[PDB]
């Protein structure tokens, strides 16, 4: 019974942990930052160069 | 843990009068101790008012039987109203047989000892203070806690306690400065200083030190070998009018 | 005992899958953090943001 | 809502030529989001009006 | 997986414990109870619903004692035993009548980065979802009812274990859900069965996102009404003690009200306090009544008081306060422990008896943060977990 309970307890703990949600959060920020740099660098080449 | 029973004396008596005639009623030998020392009320100087005389003896042959062990410690003055008091520990017939023998000998009658807040707190001050062989006074500190049992209807607040770590005790006396009465100037006012409760006005049940003494109004309990001298002196002044 | 034994085996399998996904996500986050924005292609108006 | 609402947008021209209105929306949405409205509008002029300061 | 128990099932139970339990109930609740009981499950009585009416009407018309009717129920109408739905109804009426005997304990719901989540529990969905999860583990029978005088929903959960040829019942578990609040009330029990029930409740609520349950306090609260004011959704949840008048908001009238009876225009008479310390040194009956009223305001918040007169709005059983301060460039701490029935109410009369000074009464000692045992650091109160 506690083998079921102890396993089930850490099933929720890993999914509800701040660190796991932080990994989700850092994924969004990292993907956004590279996108902004790519677009902003692209327009600078287009605006000045051919 | 040894529980001490306190008791007073109406007029000054002589006890070494007949140690030979105190034994045949009891059928075993009892020794005698004659002793007097200085009790400095003020470190700068002391008058003749601290002149104290103390007696001590026991009623036993068996050192193995620690349970059936009792001591009668006497101490007091001869110039104020109440000359002296007495204290004893343990329950046995030996704790009273001599007591009747001077029941009908000197005409002094006994009475239970009463303690209240004006006296109860100041006993721990004499308990914590120490004296060395060179007449140097240093204080060994203890984490005191207090017991409060206020009488009330509905029993809304029947018992509450205050605990002080004695490193914080150290931080309080040092802030006030070098004091001979730490509970006059570092501890008792500070409880009123922060929480606004008067310790003395409130009904106090017990003052407990960290493994040294156990003070309650009904009887004083101490785990030491024998009681000290400042404790007896402050008890004497407290029961004095 | 037999039915609950399968339940114990099933839950721990999902437990390992979720944890190993979190561990993989942690490694991926470190991979994305480095080599992607600190190198020379950084934008000076974003240099203050990275400061 | 009921309180007054304010919108911010930009548009740029190159000698009468109209730029793409799509890509110019993200570059103004994220630039003032990452630096605030007060500071964000300053580098809009710095980028659009002073391109050689970057090269 | 038909481990759930129907209404017609008859779990084994001792007749002696239920004999004394039914004696605690009055005749008026033991009368209508059996009438609904016969209308759902019948009985061993040789008659229909109508015949059972006048026969029971004769007993109550004679003013007969509570003992004989209980014997009739246990040994005549239902000699075999009591059904599981039948048992749950009895505890339903006991909860409503006397709620003091039953403990309660709070629990906060958190999700994600820690933002509080408001529960949107539905009755129909929660019954089957809880049953489905617990069906594979044990025998579950859940029955929930709405509080008659409060918006809180009370859920009764029982676990059954096989043995006596058939199974036997275990101790019940109570979970209370407020109508709109991120705090869940549940009974306190340190059992392996109790942990499973609470954990299973968290999973079925977490269908949207993972939700954790954290115990807010350690000391239980005696009454459901008391725990609803302190922690449930109410205006008194945060402001209490000397700030109780703000929650009532009776002092300030509507801006459109007539200005003739304004407090500022009329004014009020109050006692001038002396900041010099004259309490250690220690009569006009006009000044004496002010002294009693000063303590009245400090511990209750209003001169009239909101509910003898020494009782507080919500009694507190145990509080632990730790006070820390910096003197001589070092930390000085003292620990205060309290015990009783109404600690803040009991401290009120000590001021009335002039034992303690009312002017130097800290806010936490006055009654603020009722039933919140915490540590005071640098003039601020911090929750201790």
Curated annotation (Swiss-Prot), chain A:
Residues forming coiled coils: 1-47
Transmembrane domains' residue ranges: none
Cell compartments where the protein resides: Nucleus; Chromosome, Centromere, Kinetochore
Origin: domain of life: Eukaryota
Membership in a protein family: Belongs to the CENP-U/AME1 family.
Described function: Component of the kinetochore, a multiprotein complex that assembles on centromeric DNA and attaches chromosomes to spindle microtubules, mediating chromosome segregation and sister chromatid segregation during meiosis and mitosis. Component of the inner kinetochore COMA complex, which connects centromere-associated proteins and the outer kinetochore. COMA interacts with other inner kinetochore proteins to form the inner kinetochore constitutive centromere-associated network (CCAN), which serves as a structural platform for outer kinetochore assembly.
Oligomer status and interactors: Component of the heterotetrameric kinetochore subcomplex COMA, which consists of AME1, CTF19, MCM21 and OKP1. The COMA subcomplex is part of a larger constitutive centromere-associated network (CCAN) (also known as central kinetochore CTF19 complex in yeast), which is composed of at least AME1, CHL4, CNN1, CTF3, CTF19, IML3, MCM16, MCM21, MCM22, MHF1, MHF2, MIF2, NKP1, NKP2, OKP1 and WIP1. COMA binds the centromeric nucleosome-binding protein MIF2, and to the outer kinetochore MIND subcomplex, probably via AME1. AME1 interacts directly with OKP1 and an NKP1-NKP2 dimer.
Gene for this chain: AME1
Shown residues within the full chain: 217 to 266 of 324
Curated annotation (Swiss-Prot), chain B:
Swiss-Prot/TrEMBL keywords: Cell cycle, Cell division, Centromere, Chromosome, Kinetochore, Meiosis, Mitosis, Nucleus
The keyword tRNA processing is annotated on this UniProt entry: no
Signal peptide segment: none
Cellular compartments annotated: Nucleus; Chromosome, Centromere, Kinetochore
An individual GO BP term: protein localization to chromosome, centromeric region
A cellular component term, taken from the record's GO annotations: kinetochore
Principal subcellular localization: nucleus
Other comment: Present with 125 molecules/cell in log phase SD medium.
Family statement: Belongs to the CENP-L/IML3 family.
Description of how the protein assembles with itself and partners: Forms a heterodimer with IML3. CHL4-IML3 is part of a larger constitutive centromere-associated network (CCAN) (also known as central kinetochore CTF19 complex in yeast), which is composed of at least AME1, CHL4, CNN1, CTF3, CTF19, IML3, MCM16, MCM21, MCM22, MHF1, MHF2, MIF2, NKP1, NKP2, OKP1 and WIP1. Interacts with CHL4 and CTF19.
Task of the protein: Component of the kinetochore, a multiprotein complex that assembles on centromeric DNA and attaches chromosomes to spindle microtubules, mediating chromosome segregation and sister chromatid segregation during meiosis and mitosis. Component of the inner kinetochore constitutive centromere-associated network (CCAN), which serves as a structural platform for outer kinetochore assembly.
Name of the molecule in the record: Inner kinetochore subunit IML3
Organism the protein comes from: Saccharomyces cerevisiae (strain ATCC 204508 / S288c)
Gene name of this polypeptide: IML3
Curated annotation (Swiss-Prot), chain C:
Signal sequence residues: none
Subcellular location: Nucleus; Chromosome, Centromere, Kinetochore
Coiled-coil portions: 1-31
Origin: domain of life: Eukaryota
Subunit structure: Component of the heterotetrameric kinetochore subcomplex COMA, which consists of AME1, CTF19, MCM21 and OKP1. The COMA subcomplex is part of a larger constitutive centromere-associated network (CCAN) (also known as central kinetochore CTF19 complex in yeast), which is composed of at least AME1, CHL4, CNN1, CTF3, CTF19, IML3, MCM16, MCM21, MCM22, MHF1, MHF2, MIF2, NKP1, NKP2, OKP1 and WIP1. COMA binds the centromeric nucleosome-binding protein MIF2, and to the outer kinetochore MIND subcomplex. OKP1 interacts directly with AME1, with an NKP1-NKP2 dimer, and with CTF19-MCM21.
Extra remark beyond the main annotation: Present with 2688 molecules/cell in log phase SD medium.
Family: Belongs to the CENP-Q/OKP1 family.
Name of the molecule in the record: Inner kinetochore subunit OKP1
Taxonomic classification: Eukaryota, Fungi, Dikarya, Ascomycota, Saccharomycotina
Curated annotation (Swiss-Prot), chain D:
Known partners and oligomeric status: Component of the heterotetrameric kinetochore subcomplex COMA, which consists of AME1, CTF19, MCM21 and OKP1. The COMA subcomplex is part of a larger constitutive centromere-associated network (CCAN) (also known as central kinetochore CTF19 complex in yeast), which is composed of at least AME1, CHL4, CNN1, CTF3, CTF19, IML3, MCM16, MCM21, MCM22, MHF1, MHF2, MIF2, NKP1, NKP2, OKP1 and WIP1. COMA binds the centromeric nucleosome-binding protein MIF2, and to the outer kinetochore MIND subcomplex. CTF19 interacts with the CTF3 complex subunits CTF3, MCM16 and MCM22 as well as CHL4 and IML3.
Protein location: Nucleus; Chromosome, Centromere, Kinetochore
Note: Present with 1254 molecules/cell in log phase SD medium.
Source organism, top-level taxon: Eukaryota
Name of the protein in its database record: Inner kinetochore subunit CTF19
Similarity annotation: Belongs to the CENP-P/CTF19 family.
């Amino acid at each position: 019974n506690q083998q079921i309970i102890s396993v089930r307890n850490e099933i929720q703990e890993l999914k509800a942990g701040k660190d796991w949600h932080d990994l989700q959060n850092e994924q969004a920020k990292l993907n956004d930052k590279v996108k902004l740099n790519k677009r902003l660098n692209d327009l600078t080449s287009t605006l000045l160069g051919k | 843990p040894y529980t001490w029973k306190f008791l007073g004396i109406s007029k000054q008596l002589s006890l070494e009068n007949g140690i030979a005639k105190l034994n045949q009623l009891l059928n075993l030998e009892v020794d005698l101790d004659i002793q007097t020392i200085r009790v400095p009320s003020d470190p700068d100087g002391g008058t003749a008012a601290d002149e104290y005389i103390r007696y001590e003896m026991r009623l036993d042959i068996s050192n193995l039987d620690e349970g059936t062990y009792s001591k009668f410690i006497f101490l007091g003055n001869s110039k104020m109203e109440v000359p002296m008091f007495l204290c004893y520990c343990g329950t046995d017939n030996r704790n009273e047989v001599v007591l009747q023998w001077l029941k009908a000998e000197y005409g002094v009658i006994m009475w239970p000892i009463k303690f209240e807040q004006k006296t109860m707190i100041k006993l721990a001050d004499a308990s914590i203070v120490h004296v060395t062989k060179e007449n140097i006074e240093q204080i060994t500190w203890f984490s005191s806690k207090l017991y409060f049992e206020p009488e009330t209807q509905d029993k809304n607040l029947r018992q509450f306690s205050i605990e002080i770590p004695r490193e914080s005790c150290e931080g309080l006396a040092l802030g006030y400065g070098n004091t001979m009465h730490p509970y006059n100037d570092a501890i008792v006012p500070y409880i009123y200083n922060e929480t606004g409760m008067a310790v003395e006005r409130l009904p106090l049940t017990s003052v407990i030190l960290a493994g040294h003494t156990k003070i309650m109004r009904e009887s004083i309990v101490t785990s030491t070998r024998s009681l000290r001298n400042r404790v007896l002196a402050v008890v004497l002044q407290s029961i004095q009018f | 005992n037999e039915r609950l034994e399968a339940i114990l085996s099933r839950e721990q399998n999902l437990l390992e899958e979720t944890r190993k996904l979190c561990m993989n996500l942690k490694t991926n986050n470190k991979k994305r953090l480095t080599e992607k924005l600190i190198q020379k292609d950084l934008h000076p108006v974003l240099n203050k943001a990275m400061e | 809502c009921f309180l007054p609402m304010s919108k911010i947008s930009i548009a740029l021209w190159k000698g009468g030529e109209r730029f793409n209105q799509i890509d110019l929306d993200e570059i103004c949405y994220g630039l003032i989001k990452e630096y605030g409205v007060k500071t964000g509008l300053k580098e809009i002029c710095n980028v659009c009006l002073f391109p050689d300061m970057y090269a | 997986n038909e481990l759930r128990l129907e209404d017609n099932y008859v779990p084994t139970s001792d007749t002696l414990v239920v004999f004394k339990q039914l004696m605690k109930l009055p005749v008026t609740v033991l009368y209508d109870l059996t009438l609904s009981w016969f209308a759902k499950f019948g009985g061993s009585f040789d008659g229909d619903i109508y015949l059972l009416t006048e026969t029971l009407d004769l007993l109550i018309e004679k003013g007969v004692r509570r003992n004989v009717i209980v014997n009739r129920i246990l040994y005549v109408y239902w000699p075999d035993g009591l059904n599981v739905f039948q048992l749950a109804e009895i505890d339903c009426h006991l909860m409503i009548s006397k709620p003091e005997k039953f403990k309660w304990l709070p629990s906060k719901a958190l999700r994600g980065d820690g933002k509080p989540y408001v529960v949107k529990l539905q009755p129909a969905k929660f019954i089957e979802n809880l049953q489905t999860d617990l069906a594979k583990i044990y025998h579950c029978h859940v029955y929930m009812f709405k509080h008659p005088s409060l918006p809180v929903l009370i859920t009764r959960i029982q676990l059954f274990d096989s043995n006596g040829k058939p199974l036997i019942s275990r101790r019940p578990y109570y979970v209370a859900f407020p109508l709109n609040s991120p705090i869940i009330f549940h009974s306190v029990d340190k059992d392996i069965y109790a942990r499973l029930v609470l954990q299973s409740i968290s999973r079925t609520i977490s269908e949207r996102e993972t939700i954790i349950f954290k115990p807010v306090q350690k000391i239980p609260v005696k009454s459901i009404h008391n725990i609803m004011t302190l922690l449930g959704p109410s205006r008194f949840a945060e402001s209490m003690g000397p700030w109780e008048c703000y929650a009532s908001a009776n002092f300030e009238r509507s801006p459109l009200h007539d200005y003739k009876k304004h407090q500022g225009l009329t004014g009020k008479k109050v006692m001038v306090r002396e900041f010099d310390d004259s309490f250690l040194n220690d009569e006009e009956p006009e000044i004496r009544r002010l002294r009693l009223e000063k303590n009245m305001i400090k511990f209750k918040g209003s001169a009239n008081g909101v509910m003898s007169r020494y009782s507080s709005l919500v009694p507190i059983e145990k509080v632990g306060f730790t006070l820390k301060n910096e003197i001589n460039s070092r930390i000085i701490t003292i620990k205060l422990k309290f015990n009783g029935n109404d600690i803040f109410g009991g401290l009120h009369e000590l001021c009335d008896k002039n034992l303690i000074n009312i002017d130097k009464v800290p806010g936490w000692l006055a009654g603020e943060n009722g039933s919140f045992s915490g540590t005071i650091m640098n003039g601020d109160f911090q929750r201790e977990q």
